[PDB]
């Protein structure tokens, strides 16, 4: 466990190409990232993945899940944000 | 949002 | 993160690390206004864990960090533990985060955004960096 904030740039995949890894466990509310020789792994999860739109770090995903390892030439898997983000603009507007 | 103060260097 | 490295201090001001009554780092989180904050529904937050913004170095006692506590717990409804799908879980804090240079939100997408498959993005965390 690092003190430290560490940092990784990694690539999106689609969910096709992903469930060549991971199968069926793969949603519509998942996005995978990785298999790019750094993963995601025990801690990390909750945090962002976040990818830079018109100037502006934008919250693509939220770290979910990936290999008991941590393995890095295994895609890690992360909450869809964009099937997600209208329950969160309900939640706000409610709360 | 989305733009930090302190630019991140990667 | 396995083969990552360490970031700018202060430079992803949006990241939080949730620790609970005893101090230990059990998950990250973002903040998407001064008073809520996004995290993965897995994470099992309750209202007795502690929301640090402002932090890079969790072995320092010298930042500057912002300890917050939770107001309350906003699971997705739609979150199914046994697929792991719909993993986010939004948290009210009691009081709202003080937005400086190193703390401040990210941005939410549109649910019509599109982010395709080759695009180069950033993830950032405390997480273990070797299995
Ligand atoms: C949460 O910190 C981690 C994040 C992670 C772990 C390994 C690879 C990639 C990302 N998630 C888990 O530990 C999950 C927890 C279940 C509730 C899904 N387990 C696995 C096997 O990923």
Same mark, same amino acid.
Not at chain 1, 19 to 27: A, P
Not at chain 1, 75 to 82: E, I, N
Not at chain 1, 84 to 95: E, G, M
Not at chain 3, 83 to 91: A, G, Y
């Given at each position: 466990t690092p003190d430290r904030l560490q940092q990784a740039s990694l690539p999106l995949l689609s969910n096709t190409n992903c469930?060549?890894?991971?199968?069926?466990?793969?949603?519509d509310a998942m996005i995978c990232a990785g298999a790019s020789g750094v993963s995601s792994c025990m801690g990390d999860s909750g945090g962002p993945l976040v990818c830079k739109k018109n100037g502006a770090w934008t919250l693509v995903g939220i770290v979910s899940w990936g290999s008991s390892t941590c393995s890095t030439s295994t895609?890690?898997?992360?909450?869809?944000? &964009?099937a997600?983000? +209208?329950?969160?603009?309900? &939640?706000?507007?409610? +709360? | 949002?989305?733009?930090?103060?302190?630019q991140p260097v990667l | 993160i396995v083969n990552g490295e360490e970031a700018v201090p202060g430079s992803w001001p949006w990241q939080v690390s949730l620790q609970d009554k005893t101090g230990f780092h059990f998950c990250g989180?973002?903040?998407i206004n001064e008073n809520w904050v996004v995290t993965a529904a897995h994470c099992g937050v309750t209202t007795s864990d502690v929301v640090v913004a402002g932090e890079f170095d969790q072995g320092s006692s010298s930042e500057k960090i912002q300890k917050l506590k939770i107001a309350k717990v906003f699971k997705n409804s739609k979150y199914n533990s046994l697929?792991?799908?719909?993993?986010?879980?939004?948290?009210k804090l009691s009081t709202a985060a003080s937005f400086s240079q190193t703390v401040s939100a990210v941005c939410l997408p549109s649910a019509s955004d599109d982010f395709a498959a080759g695009t180069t993005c950033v993830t950032t965390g405390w997480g273990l960096t070797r299995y």
């Open positions: 469930k060549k890894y991971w199968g069926t466990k793969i949603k895609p890690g898997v992360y909450a869809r944000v &964009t997600l983000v +209208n329950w969160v603009q309900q &939640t706000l507007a409610a +709360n | 949002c989305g733009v930090p103060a302190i | 989180g973002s903040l697929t792991i799908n719909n993993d986010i879980t939004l948290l």
